[PDB]
Design a protein around this ligand. Structure first.
Ligand SMILES: Nc1ncnc2c1ncn2[C@@H]1O[C@H](COP(=O)(O)OP(=O)(O)O)[C@@H](O)[C@H]1O
Ligand SMILES: [Mg+2]
Lengths: 453, 586, 50, 455
């Protein structure tokens, strides 16, 4: 049923007349006079007509001699067991030159809302290999922990480093890593795909790639595809899944574009009025479920415009995600890799994955000690450069010597240097050993002499 | 032959009915004058046309005839050393056809000399199963660059005939036996500007470029095929920088695209570039450059054209295998041009009135650059380096243009009015400016020069980083107050920013500094940086050493001015600072 | 004694001039963009209602 | 032929709707004649089908729609040019205001003009002696240049213009400037200043003026600076004269555009100004320079009052991005009794390079200004620290710069509005002021150049 009734063309928007049975957000494709085939989507449908937006642009179309076909279905995704290892686009089409998969079933990428009473809260600790993340702001399964970066802060190295080193411990369940890429430069895209190939993580992960020049309407669909794929691996295959999305700032910029297309008036800071809700729709889809052995964990990455948290992108994200991992320009320009600053960083469910059974029995006790000692050391450092070295009590001077040794040896491991949890914990002791036995008032008599050098 | 009729004229926007045969983004001739316009949208019978010329005096009833083809540029001999318009029209020829010092209206003109003889040496043999992109011969347009004629896309067959000899770009120089029929080719091929020229695949830019500017070549380097942005308020020197890069770049071809910016800036280029001479070409710079001029008082719709034409010409020579650099000055003008047309169309605007599709349209421009391999199977590598000039209002880099640019580039040279105030030229803010190509450029360069360059540039930046944190206290505590050894840090960073970074582009020798000479200045200062630390470790008072500096510091202040060939002077002055604290410590 | 006066001057100059000038400026700056934001929002509704 | 319609549909503010017309063109000059007999000129803004929207310059007071008719002159808004224009003063629309004899116009030129072909446009390199040292030496002005003055309400920008206007002469020539003055929305007293000053420097006999005062319709301000620039490019190119263009207030021009824009319900840019402000402003400022073969020159010095004293405001922002530099005035300097109050740090000239050096000036001209900049930048900032932390809190070399920075402002910048400094005197004074510094600190001047010119 191909209609040759194209009435209007304004911008990327196109108007089709004399139609029926057409649904909202229904996928369409337009056959041109030259034969070129472009896809589209119904943005608005009235009683005897419908508005559609073409993904591949509107350049060079003759309205009289072109035709439109309605496929009678929304953006769906091909679900298959044989999916891991291959690289896809924003729409789900293969990009890896491999054997085209036969899907088990097609599902709507929007998904459904999980029943509050159905939700089962997460307990299992997840190891990412990064000390600053695996000890001070520990990641737990089913958690939603984002990463706050800036233009040029190595958030792409850390993104690669996580999925490579991210591993469940002991649990006989296999580990899935649904990676999703949003509106990124080719180099950044090529970087990630290559890096996952060589590390063998490609055979342990699923990849959804979306370049910057790719149409904005599929930039918005890219996460929804990955999350639907991630939900296909956890809840219907019983696998522990980890999701990584980059960039999330690019997702919003593309989300803004189709709003002006619908001529919808922006709510705040130029971003639409459903930004918070639209984020929650694809963020809040993570966690364990009662009765099922699945697991969905998200690590969304976003670049704060000009290093500001009060910006709508990282601010609204905070109301949805539990905690945040923040990279600092001052750290990266000092050679710290990864440039994670632990003071503004936070994990709201960290204690759920600490303690005996998940990690070493001093995990929580140590964590707060290193943390409080860092702040004190930083304050000793700031007073030192203003009043001289001598104004310091020489144990405030060792707190200062502690605080830079803390960043250079503990925080800075390297983007290609894996650190297991045990190696990180006794490392803290090795640094806490600098401090005498007198100040360590966060640790008890079982643990202080059971582990301290 | 469907002749449309105008029903509405409002500035640069012309609405014309009876255009149902025409297609979107086709070029048109509007009115009795036949001014160059383009269909942007089509509602039923009526088409909307933006005009690339002034519409003063155009009214309803007047005819409009379509051309059937989109905005395209011709690629062949006669394209170099020529200043073109945003729609590619030879201004020199335009002046020679219109007989006026001004730009007329409705005057069509072919962008290349179709009445010129070019010797074409055929370098492929007959009966070869060629494909798209394969070279069939070259024409020495310049003494330094040869114009390799390639097989236009969509054409694969077997060569029937080919021979050397003098032709124009009109008459057939070859014949290919395609399946769809017999197709003969010529030296000229035309390509739509808003369509990325196809490639085999695309590479990561590894090779650092030679800017000659010490600030960027050292701390914030851009590779061959990298994307650099230069945001800064008016007077910061955005145009100067791009002029300095165009003059002394180690690339093989440059396309300086001047849209929405001053006219004198372009007449300046055509007056001087023929007179300047610099390697890797033994000849002039005009035999390497291509100009696309669009003044600020030129038609607004023609601004977007100028950008998309300059990048298509770049992609053209990229497909040959040449390394090309395109300078867009300024990219903000393109956006401001889009903002008007968005407003005139009463479209729902995004941030600061800019179209919501600004971020996507900019990404298309930068994802059409970089090092790639061309088509065919000769597998020549070609790179497109983008040096974009962004001009944010008020100097605020939080604008939509700068923001969407810094999301799809790897290099950013932030300028600030504070340094241009001090006449700190070039005014690149070293604290925030950044290049993601830093680590890899350092690797390449420490191999080539075989000096510990990677270790030097990182610590040279640290003395700068420390300088910033140490003036934060000078306001509070004073200069002589504390951290006396840090004063040396401040007075060697003082030399870093004043003897190494401050690079005036006006003097006849510090206009360009070769990599090898660029080494010595960096070398001399951090030697002293530790030689100072060597004296404060023994106990020699810093005032004493500072006198020892002043005696030899005057020399390094001059080190910028010493010629390239005699680098030993900058190598030996190093030996003099090894001397002083041997004669000043005892 | 001399240095006390220098430090006393700096504390006084920092507390009475520097800090209050900062606070009152960020408020007047905050008010500006507060007004500018919604001054545009109204205009956008006019664009919406064309 | 004559083309006239009696079918006015709407009259709303400055805009007027005429329907059932045919053969009307864009930007066509029209004439409304009211029921009383009064003639009011206007311009076509938009024409669709049998309808046409027009803007009325003189306003739409007391118009009866049914009994009024609209004449379509069949040509755009154009100026009647002549050589007799010199010594005369016209209104906002080029009509005689001086009671002079009826002019036999040479040609009729469309005030929009045309864009100068870059290939035909040759570079401005001829240094202009302005008498003002802060301009001549530090932020050089050449002929064919578009160098504006950024001022504020209450600030003495009219004096700086008047000073330049009479102290304007180029070295190596006897070429006296034939200035053109465009008054835009300014007051009587501000206009009479230029007027009276011209009468006792005798430059009124060597100039043509276009008056549009505060009591004159704001819509006329749209055409006024184009009337001036057209007459400028006419005298300079066709008649090979050397023309100096003075336009004030440039701010009042952009105000007029926004009045029509807000009337047309157009999509507004920043501060309500039209989205096409940058382009329209450019079509004025770019209309300057020199061209191949033609001896004449058109140099342009516009004056605008920065609203809010804010450099980042749309009007001074867009102007700064277009013009070849800018001259900035400051209340801080003006209150200090500095004449002229030119803050040399945020000011700029973009043609000072090729402008000065050996042959046109002394060879130290390039090194002196760059040294004075870095010294004042350090000196002024030191003075800031001095008034809050005490003079005894600076170093010995800081107080040397702080003392230099003050003396810089009081004599170099401040010279009086009626004192003419030759380029030589300025350079000589330049070294004298920077003399009070150690040679070791000046790392921006040739050492061979130092010894020769150092006092
Ligand atoms: N690197 C530099 N060295 C010396 N002078 C400079 C430099 N950059 C800018 N300038 C001065 O500043 C002026 C502004 O140049 P331009 O590049 O047009 O600024 P922008 O591009 O930021 O508008 C120039 O006329 C020049 O005199
Ligand atoms: Mg510029």
């Amino acid at each position: 049923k191909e209609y040759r009734t194209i009435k209007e063309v304004v911008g990327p928007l196109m108007a089709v007349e004399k139609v029926s049975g057409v649904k909202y957000e229904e996928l369409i494709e337009v056959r041109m006079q030259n034969g070129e085939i472009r896809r589209g989507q119904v943005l608005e449908v009235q009683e005897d007509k419908a508005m559609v937006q073409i993904f591949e642009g509107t350049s060079g179309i003759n309205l009289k001699n072109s035709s439109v076909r309605f496929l009678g279905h929304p953006l769906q995704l091909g679900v298959s067991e044989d999916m891991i290892g291959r690289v896809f686009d924003g729409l789900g089409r293969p990009k890896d030159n491999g054997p085209e998969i036969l899907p088990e079933k097609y599902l709507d990428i929007n998904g459904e809302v999980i029943n509050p009473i159905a939700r089962d809260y997460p307990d299992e600790f997840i190891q990412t290999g990064i000390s600053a993340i695996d000890h001070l702001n520990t990641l737990v399964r089913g958690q939603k922990l984002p990463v706050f970066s800036g233009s040029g802060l190595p958030h792409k190295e850390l993104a690669a480093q996580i999925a490579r080193q991210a591993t469940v411990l002991d649990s006989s369940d296999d580990f899935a890593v649904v990676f999703a890429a949003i509106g990124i430069t080719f180099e950044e895209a090529e970087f990630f795909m290559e890096d996952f190939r060589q590390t063998g993580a490609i055979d342990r992960s699923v990849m959804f790639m979306n370049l910057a020049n790719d149409p904005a309407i599929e930039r918005i669909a890219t996460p929804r595809m990955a999350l639907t794929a991630a939900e296909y691996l956890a809840y219907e295959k019983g696998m522990h899944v980890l999701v990584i999305m980059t960039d999330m700032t690019n997702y919003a910029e593309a989300l803004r574009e189709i709003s002006a297309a619908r001529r919808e008036v922006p709510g705040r800071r130029g971003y639409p009025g459903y930004l918070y809700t639209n984020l929650a729709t694809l963020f809040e889809r993570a966690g364990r479920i009662r009765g099922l052995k699945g697991s969905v964990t998200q690590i969304p990455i976003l670049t704060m415009p000009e290093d500001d948290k009060t910006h709508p992108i990282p601010d609204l994200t905070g109301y949805i995600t539990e905690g945040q991992i923040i990279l600092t320009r001052e750290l990266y320009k000092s050679g710290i890799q990864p440039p994670i600053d632990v003071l503004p960083s936070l994990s709201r469910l960290k204690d759920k994955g600490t303690g005996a059974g998940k990690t070493r029995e001093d995990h929580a006790a140590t964590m707060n000690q290193l943390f409080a000692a860092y702040a004190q050391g930083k304050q000793a450092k700031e007073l030192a450069v203003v009043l001289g070295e001598s104004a310091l009590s020489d144990i405030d001077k060792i707190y200062a010597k502690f605080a830079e040794r803390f960043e250079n040896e503990y925080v800075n491991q390297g983007f290609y240097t894996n650190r297991t949890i045990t190696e990180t914990l006794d490392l803290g002791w090795e640094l806490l050993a600098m401090l005498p036995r007198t100040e360590l008032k966060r640790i008890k008599d079982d643990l202080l002499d059971k582990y301290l050098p | 032959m469907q002749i449309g009729k105008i029903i509405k004229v409002s500035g640069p926007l012309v609405m014309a009915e009876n255009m149902s045969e025409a297609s979107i983004q086709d070029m048109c001739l509007v009115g009795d004058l036949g001014v160059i316009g383009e269909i942007i949208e089509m509602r039923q019978d009526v088409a909307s046309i933006q005009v690339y010329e002034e519409t003063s005096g155009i009214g309803p009833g007047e005819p409009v005839r379509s051309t059937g083809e989109a905005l395209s540029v011709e690629l062949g001999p006669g394209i170099i050393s020529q200043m073109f318009d945003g729609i590619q029209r030879p201004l020199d020829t335009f002046m020679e056809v219109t007989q006026s010092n001004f730009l007329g209206r409705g005057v069509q003109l072919p962008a290349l000399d179709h009445e010129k003889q070019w010797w074409f040496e055929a370098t492929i043999e007959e009966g070869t199963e060629v494909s798209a992109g394969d070279i069939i011969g070259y024409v020495d347009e310049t003494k330094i660059i040869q114009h390799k004629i390639m097989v236009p896309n969509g054409i694969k067959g077997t060569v029937q005939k080919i021979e050397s000899g003098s032709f124009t770009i009109d008459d057939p120089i070859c014949v290919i036996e395609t399946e769809q029929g017999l197709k003969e080719l010529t030296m000229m091929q035309k390509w739509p500007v808003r369509r990325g020229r196809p490639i085999k695949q695309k590479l990561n830019p590894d090779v650092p470029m030679i800017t000659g500017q010490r600030v960027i070549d050292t701390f914030f380097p851009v590779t061959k095929g990298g994307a650099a942005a230069v945001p800064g308020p008016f007077g910061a020197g955005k145009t100067v920088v791009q002029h300095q890069i165009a003059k002394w770049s180690d690339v093989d071809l440059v396309v300086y695209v001047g849209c929405g910016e001053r006219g004198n800036e372009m007449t300046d280029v055509v007056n001087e570039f023929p007179e300047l001479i610099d390697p890797n070409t033994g000849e002039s710079l005009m035999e390497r450059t291509v100009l696309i001029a669009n003044t600020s008082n030129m038609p607004v719709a023609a601004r977007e054209a100028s950008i998309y034409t300059g990048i298509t010409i770049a992609e053209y020579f990229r497909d040959m295998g040449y390394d090309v650099a395109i300078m867009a000055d300024s990219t903000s003008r393109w956006a401001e041009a889009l903002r008007e047309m968005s407003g005139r169309l009463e479209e729902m605007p995004g941030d600061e009135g800019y179209p919501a599709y600004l971020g996507s349209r900019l990404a298309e421009y930068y994802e059409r650059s970089g090092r790639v391999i061309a088509l065919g199977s000769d597998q020549r590598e070609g790179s497109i380096t983008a040096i974009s000039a962004v001009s944010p209002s008020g100097g605020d880099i939080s604008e939509p243009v700068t923001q969407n640019t810094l999301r799809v580039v790897k290099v950013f040279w932030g300028l600030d009015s504070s340094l241009a105030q001090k006449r700190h030229f070039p005014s690149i803010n070293w604290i925030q400016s950044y290049s993601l190509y830093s680590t890899e450029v350092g690797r390449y360069m420490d191999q080539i020069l075989q000096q510990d360059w990677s270790d030097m540039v990182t610590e040279g930046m640290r003395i700068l980083q420390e300088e910033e944190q140490l003036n934060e206290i000078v306001r509070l505590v004073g200069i002589d107050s504390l951290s006396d050894n840090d004063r040396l840090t401040l007075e060697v960073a003082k030399s870093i920013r004043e003897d190494y970074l401050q690079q005036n582009a006006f003097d006849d020798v510090d206009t360009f500094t070769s990599r090898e000479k660029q080494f010595n200045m960096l070398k001399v200062i951090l030697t002293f940086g530790k030689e100072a630390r060597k004296a404060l470790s023994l106990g020699a008072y810093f005032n004493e050493i500072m006198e020892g500096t002043v005696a030899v510091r005057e020399r390094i202040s001059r080190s910028k001015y010493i010629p390239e060939e005699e680098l030993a002077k900058i190598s030996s002055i190093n030996e003099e600072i090894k001397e002083t604290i041997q004669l000043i410590v005892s | 004694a001399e240095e006390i006066e220098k430090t006393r001057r700096r504390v006084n100059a920092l507390e009475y001039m520097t800090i209050p000038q900062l606070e009152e400026t960020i408020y007047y700056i905050k008010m500006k963009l507060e007004e500018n934001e919604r001054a545009e929002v109204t205009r956008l509704i006019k664009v919406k209602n064309m």
